[PDB]
Amino acid sequence: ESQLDLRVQELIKLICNVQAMEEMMMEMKYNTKKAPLGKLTVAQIKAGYQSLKKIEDCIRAGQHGRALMEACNEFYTRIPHDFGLRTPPLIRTQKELSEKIQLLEALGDIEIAIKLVKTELQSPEHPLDQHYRNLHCALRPLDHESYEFKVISQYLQSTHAPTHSDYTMTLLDLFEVEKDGEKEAFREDLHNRMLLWHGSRMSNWVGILSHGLRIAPPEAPITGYMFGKGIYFADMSSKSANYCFASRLKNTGLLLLSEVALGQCNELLEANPKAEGLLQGKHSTKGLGKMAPSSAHFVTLNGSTVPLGPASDTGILNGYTLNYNEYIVYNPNQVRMRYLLKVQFNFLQLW
Ligand SMILES: COCCCN1Cc2cccc(C(N)=O)c2C1=O
């Protein structure tokens, strides 16, 4: 029998489920049958990113014919997909290229997860307890009556964007997060600390909790990252929640809240994959949104500003303009993971 709080038991059971990872990869068209997740290697993933660079080259030159077909076929050979009887689809847009980056990120997190979930041959501990220990990340459930639950609930609801109307979110459980080493590494000296959202797919949480949020590797396509290879956050819960890729079938997702040491922001109206080079002493990039929470409503929680909603106009308009802010830091030492929300997505099929 498990010695964990039942809330933690259910969380661990959810994120450490290998079959759920398999099903998630199958939904993304990855061929789990022919290329078992247990046998996938970091070298194979790295080569996958390299083949995306060649696709990126085609996209940035608007070459959509045989050169693109060949580049996509190379990627599909390295990272097996299951397209049934259909001609393999081409990867033609920045959006489609981003989906493939997301796949490789998920594969890397699953590679980590499969190693982590291995249990001891003989042990006095329940499997759930071994998985939990192997995270090296404390997860302490908070009561729904608590002040922290009240404020985080308010943050979640008040920053659900009105343009993200396809679903609502219900907070099922809330955990305080303390990742081994993060406090010691954190730039607690930097000003402008904010409590910001980060969403990710369900397959990714074992990786994120055990290794923290990470930046993209040098081999990844540069233009797959609209503000460069950093760690991306939102001040709108639903902007991050969209990156959970929850569905009617799998409607439980997680959202992470982290204390982010932004320091001096470099404010940008337009996307620039080379943004990190423009910092010139500044500590973070802020993609400037049309709509944002306003300072009048902000509260503090454990030394971080909480940008409570609702969102309203920022006076920012362009070319393209971001709907909502996004914040990018380029070193994990500017992040301290703080809360993990177990969220039920309630989908509305609107027409
Ligand atoms: C290929 O991936 C590029 C980064 C994609 N982006 C952009 C972004 C903005 C705001 C929040 C988030 C988040 N995950 O919560 C993200 C995100 O993942």
Q: Is 244 exposed, middle or buried (0-12, 13-18, 19+ CB in 10 A)?
A: buried
Which residue among 102, 159, 232, 326 is best mutated to probe the pocket of ligand 1, counting the most ligand atoms within 8 A of its Cβ?
232
DSSP code string of 46-94: HHHHHHHHHHHHHHHTT--SHHHHHHHHHHHHHS-B--TTSPPPP--SH
For residue 347, give its domain range: 136-351
Does residue 30 contact residue 79 with C-beta atoms inside 8 Å?
A: yes
Looking up residue 73, the CATH number of its domain turns out to be 1.20.142.10
Q: Does 227 contact ligand 1 (Cβ within 6 A)?
A: no
Q: Does 243 contact ligand 1 (Cβ within 6 A)?
A: yes
Residue of minimum CA distance from atom 4 in ligand 1: 225
Residue of minimum CA distance from atom 11 in ligand 1: 233
Smallest Cα–Cα separation from 110: which of 18, 221, 11?
Answer: 18
Query: Could you identify the atom of ligand 1 that is nearest to the CA of residue 225?
Result: 3
Measure 66 CA to ligand 1 centroid, in angstroms: 31
Q: Is 186 exposed, middle or buried (0-12, 13-18, 19+ CB in 10 A)?
A: middle
What type of residue sits at position 94?
A: Q
Residue of minimum CA distance from atom 6 in ligand 1: 232
Residue that has been written with the tokens 């501990």 in this structure? 125
Examine the fold and report which residue of 94, 114, 135 is the final residue of a domain before the chain moves on. 135
> Looking at residue 255, what DSSP letter applies?
E
Q: Is 248 one of the annotated binding-site residues? A: no
Q: Does 234 contact ligand 1 (Cβ within 6 A)?
A: yes
Indicate if 163 and 74 belong to the same structural domain. no
Examine the fold and report which residue of 135, 151, 181 is the final residue of a domain before the chain moves on. 135
* Beta partners for residue 167, in sequence order: 347
In the structure encoding, which two tokens stand for residue 128, read together?
A: 């759930």
Examine the fold and report which residue of 120, 135, 150 is the final residue of a domain before the chain moves on. 135
Does residue 256 contact residue 241 with C-beta atoms inside 8 Å?
A: no
Indicate if 44 and 187 belong to the same structural domain. no
In the structure encoding, which two tokens stand for residue 63, read together?
A: 């070459």
Distance CA 309, CA 43 (A): 44
What are φ and ψ of residue 139, in 5° steps? -130, 110
Angle at Cα 112 formed by Cα 111 and Cα 114, nearest 5°?
A: 65
Pairing of strands 299-301, 289-293: unpaired
Indicate if 128 and 173 belong to the same structural domain. no
Does residue 275 contact residue 330 with C-beta atoms inside 8 Å?
A: no
Indicate if 115 and 99 belong to the same structural domain. yes
Q: Does 253 contact ligand 1 (Cβ within 6 A)?
A: no
- 18-27 helix and 94-116 helix, angle to the nearest 10 degrees: 160
Indicate if 314 and 347 belong to the same structural domain. yes
What are φ and ψ of residue 72, in 5° steps? -70, -40
* Residue ranges with strand state E in the chain: 137-141, 167-179, 193-199, 231-233, 252-261, 265-268, 284-287, 289-293, 299-301, 304-306, 311-313, 322-324, 326-329, 335-347
Looking up residue 273, the CATH number of its domain turns out to be 3.90.228.10
CA 317 to chain centre: 27
Does residue 161 contact residue 291 with C-beta atoms inside 8 Å?
A: yes
> Looking at residue 234, what DSSP letter applies?
B
Residue that has been written with the tokens 């639903």 in this structure? 238
Quick one: CA dihedral 330, 332, 336, 340, positive or negative?
positive
Structural domain total, the chain = 2
Which uninterrupted H or E stretch holds 205? Answer: helix 205-211
Indicate if 184 and 162 belong to the same structural domain. yes
Smallest Cα–Cα separation from 212: which of 335, 311, 101?
Answer: 335
Query: CA of 265: how far to CAs of 85, 190, 308, 330, in Å?
Result: 49, 11, 20, 12
For residue 182, count other CB atoms closer than 10 A to its CB: 20
**Which residues are catalytically annotated?**
326
Experimental method: X-ray
Q: Does 134 contact ligand 1 (Cβ within 6 A)?
A: no
Q: Is 200 one of the annotated binding-site residues? A: yes
Indicate if 72 and 147 belong to the same structural domain. no
Q: Reported resolution in A?
A: 1.6
